[PDB]
From a paper:
[name] thioester-containing protein 1 ([name]) is a complement-like protein that plays a central role in the opsonization of gram-negative bacteria in the hemolymph. [name] also binds to the surface of Plasmodium ookinetes that traverse the midgut epithelium following ingestion of an infectious blood meal, targeting those ookinetes for lysis and, in certain mosquito strains, melanization. [name] is composed of a series of eight macroglobulin (MG) domains, the β-sheet CUB domain and α-helical thioester domain (TED). The TED contains an intramolecular β-cysteinyl-γ-glutamyl thioester bond that is protected from inadvertent hydrolysis by sequestration within a protein-protein interface formed by the TED and MG8 domains.
Here we report the crystal structure of full-length [name]*S1. Both loops are ordered in the [name]*S1 structure. The [name]*R1 catalytic loop contains a sequence of five residues including Lys 966 and Glu 970 (966KAGAE970). In the pre-α4 loop the substitution N919G permits a different backbone conformation for [name]*S1 with Gly 919 O within hydrogen bonding distance of Val 914 N. The displacement of the catalytic loop in [name]*S1 leads L914V to introduce a small cavity within the TED-MG8 interface between Trp 971 and the thioester bond.
Author numbering: 22 to 560, 563 to 574, 583 to 605, 629 to 821, 830 to 1338
The structure:
């Protein structure tokens, strides 16, 4: 017996099991079949038991109809033999839930921080068409901590394809991410992608023979190449050591390498023993200024002959008895075919001997004929010049050595006859055939040849075979089963997509014509990967879709299982990038030719492309189109990130020439907008050109000596060209020109609100500096035109990093409230809200809470804030992990005391908020505030709230601190408490009033916050008019961006301001602003209250008084922004900072010892979350981990190396009197002369006034110590 059926079952699938009786002992065979099944629960699902007789020399096809109600578990078919026949074999069956399978394509395997992950999702049914059932999917992407960063709740498919993207933020969560698609609630497919940060001063060296060495050369030529992980070439010295005879030193050369270098190593006498001898070469690369060394060793092979030979076998093994063709490929050492090598090829095992010469294509073709008994084939080649080559060819792993071959003798048209040619070793009594389509046996048959070896098998192509089917033939020779498969693909009914390149060569930077043809109106999905990108990461989506295009067990591959008798056996006969993420339609007729620009870069490409027609299904190209591009010539910069005014700077560059010859290069550094003064040249010079000879495959330096003129951003503009201008390259890089001192701009603000036509005159005493006047028709115009960066301070902590999140909610809040017709803004804010969400997930802890730090530092304050913060944002973005919020609110709820009180579990970094020294009134009121602002949260946690509101009620007459009370009041105001009015009046009673200014604030330490909470409660209690003097103060405390100086104040402040201005600003703006100063009078007009992005500058020169006349109806802010360039000088206020530059014994290394401690006062003996910034003198750069000597009194909770290693930021928890110290290690990596001094700063985060700055000087170098001979002044 031969029992064969599918190995898979489906809900409503037929199961046709085909039994063949060739056993001739009996005249019939009686069989019992049981197909049992059991769910994962343990419930019995299947007990379909059938009995049948299979007569001699025929087939019986059995159908098992499957119950619609199948669920995954444990299934198997059992063919046990009844009556007089001893037979019992069984085979386990798998459940396939879906009639569809899916594919996730991603443009890269790994991503650098600021990248955009691109993905396609492809759904295909069992016919390789787009599923007519499924219209959309459910795609979510999770970060390395499983957080739901994005989500497509209803991702509509087009031609079974969903295309989308995801931006990885500036400072993201590193590791493995997880795209996962879901259909009808069941996960269909899942792909991972990685995110790694490629920083550090770590570099790689490679050594290779520039030309494959011959014995005849008596010399080794080398290419030495050292690049940083960044992609930039390394400058340094290469120490070369060559070893000809074992570990005995033969030679030592040294060369300065600028990324790429050539070295020649000559020998005295080198006679080899064989025709190939290895040579060990050690290279030691010493990084230019640090002296950091990387050693690379390699075995460089030397050869006797100028050619090598390989054997091009038609197949890896020969079938004994059948002609085995092959050839010898003669390859020149690196390159051509060896056209004309004479020799004799000898295969003794067939008795074949030929003396010939390699042809034009460099080949000698062997068409051997091994007989029935041939073990190995000894292909031996001996040449007239003595060259020797022998490689053995072995026979196919003969499980039988008696085969059956099936050959489809004509094209497979639908309905038309299918003709096949069966060839078999034995004279056949019988053969079986089976036909699979859509995972089940469609047709079978017991064919009986008349003791023949050949049979012309003729079958009708039925409709159940459309469009992809597969036929399988089997028979018995001896007591072993032999078989063969054949593909039955109706080409006339399938997607015949093809993609091609032009008949021209591919030049990097130039454009190429892509010619593709296929089904009209079909979807096409192009992608091009860097072949080097498919390195350690893929070694790849293409194989999966290649595998999905069609279909060593040739049954389990055909989707079947096979059983036979106990004595019968089975046979077995066997810089970088990402570009061209396009998707096009075949359209018009039968081909669409898209035209594209090849990236200007030295890289090996890999170009794929699939196609999906709604009718015709999937199409694919065979091998991905593959080429490489070598950019002829390019320049590479090596520039400091920041320089100061009046320092002399060497801008280094490196030219690479990849052309055949050595050509002179011109490099021209341009003076863009008076930015750049070339040292020793007339100031009116617009450019400066130098010219250098550049050898092939060698890096050559070229530098310019400059000093910066204007502050801000210096554009470093360079054009280059070799070979008379035939090959050009240019770069547009930027060095940032910093002031000498830590500059901080002040901004005085006035606001007007006129409902009825009103004239008024606002004076502005301006009392070195530069001034700018701004009129802004909305609180948020300055804010939104700054969103992505609102604060002058770093924000690398859980609380601070919310500036990327919260301000966006509030800007979205307002725009929807007022019903803004400026969708243009809403878009920016909504986009930034999402990226803000992702950024913040980095501060999620394991227990569901949020912490001040990435790894540690869990916090109650923060958890309340972040949790409820997100709950609000939910109405503006789909992507929020709804349960993740709930689980964060639940962590919070449990942390409450029995009184209803909340304490901060973990260190104190925001004192007024996290201080328990005042009944924890602050934190309690805050947490209650957070819960109350969300309708879901208010109901779900109502019991926790009720306990808190009572704790406040019992505390109300006891609260005597303005901060605490302001929130307690806000809580009650939101709550709708009975004692709300009381609370607010007790707050009002604490207010500082200045009637000679129309200002009202709430005092001591955290004024901006307290006052904001206060105003919120006002607007709540409809005290709008009384809120106007409150606002007047707040608006005047704003930072230049439109926000407030710090994090929290911004958050509560902007909230307060928008809230009042919602209820006080007139429905229509129609007014004129007259600006009188010095001599001039400027005029501004506002007539559309609508528009937000609406800028009104004017730069007053250093004048005296300033007089503004507002006339009409509307809202407005009159801002006057003083910006300061001051002298850099030491200052201390309630912090004591000290600097000491320890000795290193190297000019090219700075180590600075820094010491900072808080100066206490009265009850205040400890600071808030304190940061230290370290600025380096121009040219210096900090390494990977530049900090050492760290004190354990107060430990650095977080480090931030920003600004291309110019600045190190150091987050502490707090500072006491106990000295907190460390030591920075920087390296002078750029030539900068006349260096102006740097500084270190310590500050309290949430208290502006408490800070300390200390200046320090490094050896300020001179112009002569730095200039190249051409640019040098006479004094050298
Ligand atoms: C290429 O794929 C994109 C999906 O990114 C398809 O663009 C969508 O087209 C439909 C109409 O067919 C629109 O309703 C969507 O708004 C489009 N989405 C986007 C993001 O623009 C497009 O169908 C595909 N094919 C071609 C030829 O452009
Ligand atoms: C040009 C220059 O400054 N060269 C110095 C050299 O004088 C000094 O002896 C050495 C360290 O010992 O470092 C280098
Ligand atoms: C299944 O049903 C058949 C016939 O109805 C019976 O003979 C057999 O015992 C049953 N098997 C199981 C495992 O329940
Ligand atoms: C190796 O390079 C050196 C220097 O460029 C040259 O003298 C020699 O001809 C080269 N050898 C070969 C085999 O190209
Ligand atoms: C298949 O083709 C036609 C269907 O109309 C039929 O007449 C013929 O008998 C069939 N059989 C074979 C063996 O081709
Ligand atoms: C170039 O820069 C400075 C800007 O402070 C200015 O004083 C100087 O006159 C400028 N020169 C020209 C030609 O604009
Ligand atoms: C406002 O000022 C203008 C011009 O100075 C003056 O004519 C007028 O009295 C004022 N107008 C109103 C409507 O108050
Ligand atoms: C590196 O070696 C050079 C050799 O001149 C020396 O000047 C310098 O002091 C060394 N730097 C360090 C960091 O050891």
């Amino acid at each position: 017996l031969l029992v064969v059926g599918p190995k898979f079952i489906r809900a409503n699938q037929e199961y046709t099991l085909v039994i063949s009786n060739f056993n001739s002992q009996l005249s019939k065979v009686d069989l019992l079949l049981k197909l049992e099944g059991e769910t994962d629960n343990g419930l019995s699902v299947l007990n379909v038991t059938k009995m049948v007789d299979v007569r001699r020399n025929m087939n019986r096809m059995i159908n098992f109809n499957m119950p619609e109600e199948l669920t995954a578990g444990n299934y198997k078919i059992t063919i046990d033999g009844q009556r007089g026949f001893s037979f019992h074999k069984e085979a386990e069956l798998v459940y396939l839930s879906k009639s569809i399978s899916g594919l996730i394509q991603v443009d890269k395997p790994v991503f650098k921080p600021g990248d955009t992950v691109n993905f396609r999702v492809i759904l295909l049914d069992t016919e390789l068409k787009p599923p007519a059932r499924v219209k959309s999917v459910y795609v979510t992407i999770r970060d390395p901590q499983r957080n739901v960063i994005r989500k497509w709740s209803t991702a509509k498919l087009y031609a079974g394809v969903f295309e989308s993207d995801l931006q990885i933020v500036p400072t993201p969560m590193l590791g493995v991410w997880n795209i996962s698609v879901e259909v009808e609630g069941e996960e269909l497919v899942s792909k991972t992608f990685e995110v790694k940060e490629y920083v550090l001063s770590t570099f790689d060296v490679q050594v290779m023979p520039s030309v494959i060495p011959l014995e005849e050369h008596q010399a080794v030529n080398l290419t030495i190449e050292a690049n940083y992980h960044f992609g930039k070439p390394v400058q340094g010295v290469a120490k070369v050591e060559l070893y000809l005879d074992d570990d005995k030193l033969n030679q030592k050369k040294e060369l300065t390498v600028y990324g790429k270098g050539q070295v020649e190593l000559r020998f005295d006498n080198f006679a080899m023993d064989a025709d190939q001898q290895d040579v060990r070469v050690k290279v030691s690369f010493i990084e230019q200024y640090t002296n950091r060394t990387v050693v690379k060793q390699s075995q460089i092979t030397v050869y006797r002959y100028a050619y090598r030979v390989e054997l091009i076998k038609e197949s890896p093994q020969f079938r004994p008895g059948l002609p085995f063709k092959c050839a010898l490929q003669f390859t020149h050492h690196d390159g051509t075919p060896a056209k004309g090598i004479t020799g004799k090829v000898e295969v003794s095992d067939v008795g074949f001997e030929t003396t010939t010469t390699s042809d034009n294509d460099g080949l000698i073709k062997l068409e051997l004929q091994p007989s029935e008994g041939t073990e190995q084939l000894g292909i031996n080649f001996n040449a007239v010049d003595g060259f020797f080559f022998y490689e053995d060819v072995n026979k196919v792993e003969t499980v039988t050595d008696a085969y059956i071959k099936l050959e489809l003798k004509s094209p497979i048209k639908r309905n038309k006859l299918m003709r096949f040619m069966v060839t078999c070793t034995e004279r056949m009594t019988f053969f079986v055939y089976y036909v699979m389509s859509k995972g089940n046996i469609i047709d079978a048959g017991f064919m009986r040849p008349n003791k023949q070896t050949k049979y012309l098998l003729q079958l009708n192509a039925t409709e159940k075979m459309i469009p992809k089917a597969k036929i399988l033939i089997a028979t018995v020779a001896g007591r072993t089963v032999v078989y063969d498969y054949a593909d039955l693909d109706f080409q006339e009914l399938r997607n015949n997509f093809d993609l091609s390149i032009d008949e021209q060569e591919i030049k990097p930077g130039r454009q190429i014509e892509l010619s593709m043809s296929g089904r009209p109106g079909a979807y096409v999905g192009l992608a091009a990967y860097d072949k080097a990108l498919l390195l350690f990461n893929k070694n790849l989506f293409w194989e999966d879709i290649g595998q999905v295009f069609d279909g060593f067990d040739i049954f389990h591959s055909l989707g079947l299982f096979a059983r036979t008798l106990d004595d019968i056996l089975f046979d077995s006969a066997n810089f970088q990038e990402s570009w061209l993420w396009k998707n096009v339609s075949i359209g018009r007729s039968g081909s669409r030719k898209l035209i594209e620009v090849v990236p200007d870069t030295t890289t090996s490409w890999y170009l794929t492309g699939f196609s999906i027609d709604p009718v015709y299904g999937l199409g694919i190209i065979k091998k991905p189109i593959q080429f490489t591009t070598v950019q002829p010539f390019y320049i590479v910069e090596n520039l400091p990130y920041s320089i100061k005014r009046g320092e002399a700077v060497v801008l280094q560059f490196t030219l690479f020439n990849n052309l055949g010859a050595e050509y002179i290069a011109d490099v021209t550094l341009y003076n863009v907008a008076n930015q750049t003064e070339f040292v020793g040249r007339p100031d009116t010079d617009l450019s400066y050109t130098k010219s250098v000879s550049v050898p092939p495959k060698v890096g050559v330096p070229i530098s310019f000596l400059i000093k910066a003129r204007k502050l801000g951003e210096m554009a470093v503009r360079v054009k280059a060209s070799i070979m008379l201008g035939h090959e050009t390259d240019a770069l547009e890089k930027v060095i940032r020109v910093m002031p000498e001192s830590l500059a901080q701009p002040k901004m005085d603000t006035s606001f007007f609100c006129f409902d009825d036509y009103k004239n008024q005159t606002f004076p502005f005493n301006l009392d070195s500096k530069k001034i700018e006047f701004r009129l802004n028709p909305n609180l948020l115009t300055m804010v939104i035109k700054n969103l992505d960066n609102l604060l002058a301070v770093p924000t690398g902590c859980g609380e601070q990093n919310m500036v990327k999140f919260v301000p966006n909610i509030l800007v979205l809040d307002y725009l929807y409230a007022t019903g803004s017709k400026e969708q243009h803004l809403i878009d920016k804010a909504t986009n930034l809200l999402r990226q803000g969400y992702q950024n913040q997930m980095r501060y999620r802890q394991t227990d569901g809470s949020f912490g001040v730090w990435e790894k540690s530092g869990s916090s109650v304050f923060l958890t309340a804030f972040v949790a409820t913060s997100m709950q609000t944002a939910s109405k503006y973005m789909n992507d929020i992990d709804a349960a993740m919020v709930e689980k964060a609110l639940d962590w919070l709820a449990s942390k409450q005391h029995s009184s209803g009180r909340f304490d901060e579990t973990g260190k104190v970094w925001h004192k007024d908020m996290q201080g328990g020294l005042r009944n924890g009134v602050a934190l309690t009121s805050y947490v209650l505030t957070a819960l109350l602002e969300n309708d879901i949260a208010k109901v779900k946690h109502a019991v926790v709230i009720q306990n808190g509101m009572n704790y406040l009620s019992n505390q109300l007459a006891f609260i005597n601190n303005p901060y605490d009370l302001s929130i307690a009041t806000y809580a009650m105001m939101l709550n709708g408490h009975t004692m709300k009015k009381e609370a607010l009046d007790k707050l009002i009673d604490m207010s500082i009033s200045d009637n000679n200014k129309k200002e009202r604030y709430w005092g001591t330490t955290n004024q901006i916050e307290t006052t904001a909470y206060a105003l919120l409660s006002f607007v709540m209690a409809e005290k709008y008019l009384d809120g106007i003097p409150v606002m007047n103060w707040l608006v005047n405390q704003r930072y230049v961006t439109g926000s407030f100086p710090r994090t929290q104040d911004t958050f509560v402040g902007l909230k307060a301001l928008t809230k009042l201005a919602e209820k006080i600003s007139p429905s229509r703006n129609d007014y004129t602003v007259q600006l009188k100063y010095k001599k001039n009078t400027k005029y501004f007009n506002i007539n559309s209250e609508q528009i937000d992005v609406q800028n009104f500058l004017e730069i007053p020169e250093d004048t005296k008084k300033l007089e503004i006349n507002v006339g009409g109806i509307g809202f407005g802010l009159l801002e006057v922004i003083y910006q300061f360039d001051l002298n850099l000088v030491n200052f201390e206020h309630r912090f004591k900072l000290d600097l000491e530059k320890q000795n290193t014994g190297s000019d090219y290394e700075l180590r600075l010892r820094v010491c900072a401690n808080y100066i206490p006062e009265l009850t205040d003996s400890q600071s808030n979350m304190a940061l230290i910034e370290v600025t380096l003198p121009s040219g210096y750069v900090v390494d990977r981990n530049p900090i050492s000597e760290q004190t354990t009194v107060n430990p650095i909770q977080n480090m931030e190396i920003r600004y291309g290693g110019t600045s190190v930021v150091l987050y502490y928890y707090k500072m006491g009197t106990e000295r907190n110290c460390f030591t920075v290690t920087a390296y002078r990596r750029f030539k900068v002369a006349l260096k102006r001094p740097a500084y270190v700063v310590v500050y309290d985060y949430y208290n502006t006034n408490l800070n300390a700055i200390k200046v320090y000087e490094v050896d300020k170098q001179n112009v002569c110590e730095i200039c190249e001979e051409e640019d040098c002044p006479a004094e050298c």
